[PDB]
Design an enzyme around this catalytic site. Sequence first.
Site, PDB file in Angstrom:
ATOM      1  CE1 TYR A 108      -0.700   4.495  -6.546  1.00  0.00           C
ATOM      2  CE2 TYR A 108      -2.054   4.275  -8.427  1.00  0.00           C
ATOM      3  CZ  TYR A 108      -1.151   3.943  -7.456  1.00  0.00           C
ATOM      4  OH  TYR A 108      -0.454   2.507  -7.811  1.00  0.00           O
ATOM      5  CG  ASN A 150      -1.204  -6.794  -0.767  1.00  0.00           C
ATOM      6  OD1 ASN A 150      -2.356  -6.365  -1.190  1.00  0.00           O
ATOM      7  ND2 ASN A 150      -0.178  -6.162  -1.360  1.00  0.00           N
ATOM      8  CD  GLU A 151       1.039  -7.143  -5.106  1.00  0.00           C
ATOM      9  OE1 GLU A 151       1.886  -6.228  -4.599  1.00  0.00           O
ATOM     10  OE2 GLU A 151       0.817  -6.714  -6.302  1.00  0.00           O
ATOM     11  CD  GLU A 154      -3.575  -4.375  -5.663  1.00  0.00           C
ATOM     12  OE1 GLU A 154      -2.710  -3.759  -6.239  1.00  0.00           O
ATOM     13  OE2 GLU A 154      -3.324  -4.844  -4.456  1.00  0.00           O
ATOM     14  CB  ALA A 205      -0.982   0.115   1.057  1.00  0.00           C
ATOM     15  CD  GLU A 206       2.387   1.834  -3.021  1.00  0.00           C
ATOM     16  OE1 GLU A 206       1.388   2.280  -3.552  1.00  0.00           O
ATOM     17  OE2 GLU A 206       2.828   0.764  -3.505  1.00  0.00           O
TER      18      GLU A 206
HETATM   19  O1  LIG Z   1       0.678   1.180  -6.011  1.00  0.00           O
HETATM   20  C1  LIG Z   1       1.305   0.086  -6.167  1.00  0.00           C
HETATM   21  C2  LIG Z   1       0.362  -1.160  -5.795  1.00  0.00           C
HETATM   22  O2  LIG Z   1       0.905  -2.280  -6.059  1.00  0.00           O
HETATM   23  C3  LIG Z   1       0.215  -3.523  -5.781  1.00  0.00           C
HETATM   24  O3  LIG Z   1       0.456  -4.677  -6.674  1.00  0.00           O
HETATM   25  C4  LIG Z   1      -0.024  -3.523  -4.633  1.00  0.00           C
HETATM   26  O4  LIG Z   1      -0.923  -4.789  -4.545  1.00  0.00           O
HETATM   27  C5  LIG Z   1      -0.439  -2.448  -3.638  1.00  0.00           C
HETATM   28  O5  LIG Z   1      -0.570  -2.953  -2.556  1.00  0.00           O
HETATM   29  C6  LIG Z   1       0.342  -1.189  -4.219  1.00  0.00           C
HETATM   30  O6  LIG Z   1       1.462  -1.374  -3.510  1.00  0.00           O
END
Ligand SMILES: OC[C@H]1O[C@@H](O)[C@H](O)[C@@H](O)[C@H]1O
Length: 957
Positions: free
Chosen positions: A316, A160-161, A250, A102-103
């Site tokens: 973003y 997550n990933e 995502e 999630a940065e």
């Molecule tokens: O903004 C980049 C995004 O990259 C995705 O792959 C990740 O699942 C998110 O948590 C976020 O880091």
Amino acid sequence: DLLQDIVTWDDKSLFINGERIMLFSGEVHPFRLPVPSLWLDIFHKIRALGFNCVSFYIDWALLEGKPGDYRAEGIFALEPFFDAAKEAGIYLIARPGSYINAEVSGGGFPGWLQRVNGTLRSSDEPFLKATDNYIANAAAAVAKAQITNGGPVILYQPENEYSDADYMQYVMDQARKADIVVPFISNDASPSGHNAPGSGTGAVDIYGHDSYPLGFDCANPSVWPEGKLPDNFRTLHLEQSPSTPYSLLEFQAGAFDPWGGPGFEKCYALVNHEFSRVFYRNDLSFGVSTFNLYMTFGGTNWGNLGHPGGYTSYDYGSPITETRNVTREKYSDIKLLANFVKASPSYLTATPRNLTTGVYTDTSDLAVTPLIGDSPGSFFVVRHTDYSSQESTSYKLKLPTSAGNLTIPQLEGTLSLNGRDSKIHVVDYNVSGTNIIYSTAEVFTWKKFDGNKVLVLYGGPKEHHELAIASKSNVTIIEGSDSGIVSTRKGSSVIIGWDVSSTRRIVQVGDLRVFLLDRNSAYNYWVPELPTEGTSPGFSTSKTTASSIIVKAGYLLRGAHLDGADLHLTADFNATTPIEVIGAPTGAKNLFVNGEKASHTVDKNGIWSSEVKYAAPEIKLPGLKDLDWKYLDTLPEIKSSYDDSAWVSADLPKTKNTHRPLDTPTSLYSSDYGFHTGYLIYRGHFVANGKESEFFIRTQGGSAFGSSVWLNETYLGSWTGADYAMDGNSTYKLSQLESGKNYVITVVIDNLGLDENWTVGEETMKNPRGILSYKLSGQDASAITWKLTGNLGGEDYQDKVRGPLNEGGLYAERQGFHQPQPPSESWESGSPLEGLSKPGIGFYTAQFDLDLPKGWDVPLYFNFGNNTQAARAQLYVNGYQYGKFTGNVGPQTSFPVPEGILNYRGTNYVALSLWALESDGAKLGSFELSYTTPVLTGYGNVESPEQPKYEQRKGAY
Ligand SMILES: OC[C@H]1O[C@@H](O)[C@H](O)[C@@H](O)[C@H]1O
Ligand SMILES: *[C@@H]1O[C@H](CO)[C@@H](O[C@@H]2O[C@H](CO)[C@@H](O[C@@H]3O[C@H](CO[C@H]4O[C@H](CO[C@H]5O[C@H](CO)[C@@H](O)[C@H](O)[C@@H]5O)[C@@H](O)[C@H](O[C@H]5O[C@H](CO)[C@@H](O)[C@H](O)[C@@H]5O)[C@@H]4O)[C@@H](O)[C@H](O[C@H]4O[C@H](CO[C@H]5O[C@H](CO)[C@@H](O)[C@H](O)[C@@H]5O)[C@@H](O)[C@H](O)[C@@H]4O[C@H]4O[C@H](CO)[C@@H](O)[C@H](O)[C@@H]4O[C@H]4O[C@H](CO)[C@@H](O)[C@H](O)[C@@H]4O)[C@@H]3O)[C@H](O)[C@H]2NC(C)=O)[C@H](O)[C@H]1NC(C)=O
Ligand SMILES: CC(=O)N[C@H]1[C@H](O[C@H]2[C@H](O)[C@H](O)[C@H](O[C@H]3[C@H](O)[C@@H](CO)O[C@@H](O[C@H]4[C@H](O)[C@H](O)[C@H](O[C@H]5[C@H](O)[C@@H](CO)O[C@@H](O[C@H]6[C@H](O)[C@H](O)[C@H](O[C@H]7[C@H](O)[C@@H](CO)O[C@@H](O[C@H]8[C@H](O)[C@H](O)[C@H](O[C@H]9[C@H](O)[C@H](O)[C@H](O)O[C@@H]9CO)O[C@@H]8CO)[C@@H]7NC(C)=O)O[C@@H]6CO)[C@@H]5NC(C)=O)O[C@@H]4COP(=O)(O)O)[C@@H]3NC(C)=O)O[C@@H]2CO)O[C@H](CO)[C@@H](O)[C@@H]1O
Ligand SMILES: *[C@@H]1O[C@H](CO)[C@@H](O[C@@H]2O[C@H](CO)[C@@H](O[C@@H]3O[C@H](CO[C@H]4O[C@H](CO)[C@@H](O)[C@H](O[C@H]5O[C@H](CO)[C@@H](O)[C@H](O)[C@@H]5O)[C@@H]4O)[C@@H](O)[C@H](O[C@H]4O[C@H](CO)[C@@H](O)[C@H](O)[C@@H]4O[C@H]4O[C@H](CO)[C@@H](O)[C@H](O)[C@@H]4O)[C@@H]3O)[C@H](O)[C@H]2NC(C)=O)[C@H](O)[C@H]1NC(C)=O
Ligand SMILES: *[C@@H]1O[C@H](CO)[C@@H](O[C@@H]2O[C@H](CO)[C@@H](O[C@@H]3O[C@H](CO)[C@@H](O)[C@H](O[C@H]4O[C@H](CO)[C@@H](O)[C@H](O)[C@@H]4O[C@H]4O[C@H](CO)[C@@H](O)[C@H](O)[C@@H]4O)[C@@H]3O)[C@H](O)[C@H]2NC(C)=O)[C@H](O)[C@H]1NC(C)=O
Ligand SMILES: *[C@@H]1O[C@H](CO)[C@@H](O[C@@H]2O[C@H](CO)[C@@H](O)[C@H](O)[C@H]2NC(C)=O)[C@H](O)[C@H]1NC(C)=O
Ligand SMILES: *[C@@H]1O[C@H](CO)[C@@H](O[C@@H]2O[C@H](CO)[C@@H](O)[C@H](O)[C@H]2NC(C)=O)[C@H](O)[C@H]1NC(C)=O
Ligand SMILES: *[C@@H]1O[C@H](CO)[C@@H](O)[C@H](O)[C@H]1NC(C)=O
């Protein structure tokens, strides 16, 4: 592994109560907008896009800053979020972690994880235990809001990933123990089938994956590198998880931006309205049925919640901006697409086929992916074969339809695909029992208005189009000129050709009215559901989709409801706006806009017509330079009168960090002592021996950090900071010291957050903050004994209202002077525009009134001039830290702060720390408060959250 009977699935899509649904979804992070009363705003704007779903993270680091003390209230309460989703009729996908990436600081992990004797994201018992309290609390909150209790939560993402398989399984059982019963969905970082159904221990219920084809380097927005657009996702899906519906958890809707990056503007310019129209139609060509855009609302990394690889802003380049506005063209363009999906249930059953070149068109310069199922109703997605092409391409279609293989246009003209665009052509499209044999122009929506059917079509500028209707009736033009329009009959079909124009035409064929728009006018249309009791539309259902209306407005349409004979529109406006209501119910007699009766007109075709005038109100903002600024020295540690005897001693012989063994006699890692956030200050006490000549020090604050060192009151220098450097090596020369006297070395270190932990087994989140090593020439390292501080109380953090991350280790922050009503009348006059004349850190304070008009949404920004000095600043607004400015790193100079945090009809307290890392001192070039277009809003009152005032703290130093 099905565990309830509400949300089920097959190989084509999810079902909710036995009815297929396409989840068109947006990512929103509530913790990145600490104003609960604004969350509904975000949901309105996402529902108005045509979405029916939202995806969100929960950030462990903000909820359990103190180990064992879970706290999720006020700005961090999950309940108002679930309520808002329910009120807006939005389903939720819950993604609680415990690791979220999630940065954000630590990728979600609290700083105390640096003390845990086990590998992170592994089946190591100490790490599993560490996550237990957090998941038992967070997932319990998510459980009450599941759809099986009538809440909005329909799905749950564990971890997550990810990538032991044991670890994944545990996190699933752990959620199940907390009464999560909905299906589990995954988010593989690439389509590799990790944790898909059938993969053994750790398999989810529905396999999902991520994709950001253009990556995150926003430096050259106009350039789309060859071969970056994915074309094999539907093949990969059939290999990896054909039993579950294709799911993109995502998909790229913007980009993040590091310190020293090009800025979110270029990020938007890369991932613009062309990206969305080309790439998202590309995802439909794979027959995706759960489709989440990350991010669709970004927000702000306020209060140090972000990770070092990013700065304060999380705009973003998203469809909805940081200041929550929907001006970006990508927004309007996404809306066109989502409205087509919403109106087109046959899309889910139209099975996707291999892409083709030179089969359905003459040219191979175009690619066509057909969607064709067991029953009539098909779709052809067209794009340039080289997705990056700016070429304007002419072409004809050879499509297989229920009336035979047709060559289109059958009448005059040619089709066009102009540059970075993509079309979904429809064949045998069912408009409530009337068959549209084909249509080359894209569908926006259709409705049956009980008697008369309406179909809305659009194309881009300078395009020609054609459609064919299975109909016995004649063709009449009931609005606009027949200029450019041709029609003929061919057997039992009616063929119609037309040129896109900036003026609307409406064509009637029997009981069917076809609206013919250009793309830019379609941008202004909306399709809100029309509830007849209450003002909430309810969750998305085919019955609620069927009773929606078509409205032409402007900036935003939040909703519509029918109150007896009164038709109510709720809307926002940024210009004088013509309004049109299409498909008003027969009982309706009156038009209301934002609770005010509005005059209207009915034309020959029964369309309602009204107008709302816009007149920008006068906006009075105080000039920040004119304010009565107070100055305080917030580094009194570099004066010989300071007493640090209350500070914690950094005297641990062994670190508890399993990832970086010490190089120093004691641990100087801040997290060993419970300090994880904000500025850090170290103090090294020693007796001189007269043999000292140099002092070496390696500091670490995460990338783009700075640090400054004094020996007693003498400045030695600074590590000035750069985007690539997470650590800094510094050697300072020393003129001779008085043998036998006490000396104290003071080190100040910017901490920009803790690392994420993207690669399992690599443990990067355990990267310590503080002093890594040091050498005092001519002295033994153990001769220096260290004290340190971060935020007052460490994990016993002082500000429960603003969370464990908001305030750092500066003296002013330790006392709580950044809060409302500081004890500042006794302080010296001094503006940050005048600043410091030597290295050190000042603290600046002022208050001002605002008196902005009710009924208006007005984005406000703090703007910093850039004189390029090596200066660091922290902005605080009514106690909330809303900006880190660093003059020699960038790129952020404009810092938006939302209403709620700012008080629009009341008093505000601004505070500002200014750190000078250069020997000449430092100042701000300018400091203005500005605004952008005032929006006439139909949203209600925005309530401020708690803004606790300054109060003397027990044990402050
Ligand atoms: O903004 C980049 C995004 O990259 C995705 O792959 C990740 O699942 C998110 O948590 C976020 O880091
Ligand atoms: C107000 O205005 C002022 C003035 O306008 C603004 O100040 C300026 O800000 C910019 C942006 O921060 C500063 O530029 C950066 O400076 C960085 C540091 O430079 C120094 O360090 C490195 C040292 O590292 C090497 O050597 C050491 C040992 O010495 C090794 O240990 C190490 O591992 C390396 O080998 C040196 O390379 C550099 O040397 C130069 O200078 C000396 C002396 O002059 C020379 O002798 C050298 O030969 C050389 O000339 C120097 O010592 C630097 O790291 C950073 O570089 C990145 O970006 C460069 C291009 O940036 C331009 O374009 C960007 C878009 O691409 C813009 O965003 C940017 O603003 C600028 O216009 C690339 O050339 C470089 O390869 C780096 O690229 C990375 O980052 C880019 C931007 O994000 C990405 O596009 C790239 O893909 C790449 O990203 C990858 O890495 C990064 C980390 O670097 C990750 O974050 C990322 O995710 C990905 O992995 C850049 O040049 C500038 O110094 C500063 N100017 C002044 C006068 O101070 C200020 O910002 C502004 N303030 C406000 C509030 O707005
Ligand atoms: C009919 C009509 O007119 N229609 C028209 C229509 O109108 C729309 C309209 O648009 C509306 O938006 C509306 O939407 C509505 C919707 O209808 C309804 C659905 O029913 O929901 C609405 O919003 C509601 C929200 O969802 C919430 O439910 C909210 O509930 C809040 C309450 O309102 C509020 C009241 O005060 O209370 C909140 O809870 C807070 C508490 O008040 C409390 O005080 C808490 O304070 C805490 C503090 O937070 C924490 C910080 O961490 O600290 C706590 O103390 C700590 C302390 O720090 C200590 O140190 C200590 O530490 C101890 C420790 O304990 C331990 O002992 C140890 O030993 O020592 C330690 C020492 O360190 O810890 C303690 C721990 O306590 C504080 N506690 C204390 C005691 O001090 O904070 C709470 C926050 O959580 C409630 N929130 C929650 C989460 O509970 O109500 C909202 C409704 O408001 P409203 O009535 O005013 O509107 C929703 N509204 C919105 C805005 O969305 O829809 C209507 C439809 O009608 O518009 C149409 C269209 O235009 C129009 O056409 C139509 O006509
Ligand atoms: C009240 O709210 C409303 C929304 O409800 C706001 O309205 C929006 O305002 C934004 C601007 O803030 C508009 O977006 C911009 O529009 C520019 C182009 O015009 C568009 O309409 C014209 C007709 O008037 C069309 O002809 C254009 O279409 C053609 O061009 C586009 C883009 O090239 C092609 O993709 C199409 O195929 C057509 O050929 C547009 O639809 C547009 O220039 C601008 O886009 C540029 O900048 C963005 C990033 O900022 C880039 O992504 C994009 O590539 C463009 O950059 C071009 O030019 C730059 C130079 O700067 C070059 O470097 C690039 O290479 C590139 O060629 C942007 O898209 C939006 O359309 C509009 N929406 C609506 C519904 O009205 C109001 O602003 C608001 N009012 C107030 C007071 O706040
Ligand atoms: C919707 O949301 C988006 C994203 O939130 C908004 O986009 C941001 O908008 C802000 C404010 O416009 C913008 O910041 C400006 O960018 C400009 C271009 O880079 C700057 O010119 C501007 O700074 C100058 O102007 C300020 C006043 O307008 C001054 O206070 C400031 O000191 C700067 O000074 C200028 O002029 C002086 C003398 O006149 C000169 O000395 C300077 O060198 C300079 O010329 C602002 O920084 C952000 O870039 C946008 N942020 C992002 C991420 O996009 C958008 O505005 C919203 N839309 C609506 C309609 O509300
Ligand atoms: C450097 O600074 C320290 C304070 O940080 C000075 O320490 C004082 O020294 C005297 C004499 O030894 C003590 O009696 C005081 O108690 C000390 N003050 C504190 C708060 O510890 C020290 O004198 C300074 N050194 C030089 C050479 O100027
Ligand atoms: C500070 O100095 C250290 C070396 O003392 C640098 O760390 C080394 O980096 C190299 C290559 O990047 C590694 O192979 C070594 O293992 C590292 N050495 C040690 C002991 O860590 C570090 O890069 C320097 N920091 C900066 C910003 O230049
Ligand atoms: C099938 O699709 C692939 C991309 O996945 C493409 O490269 C290939 O040419 C296609 N095969 C056909 C039918 O032409």
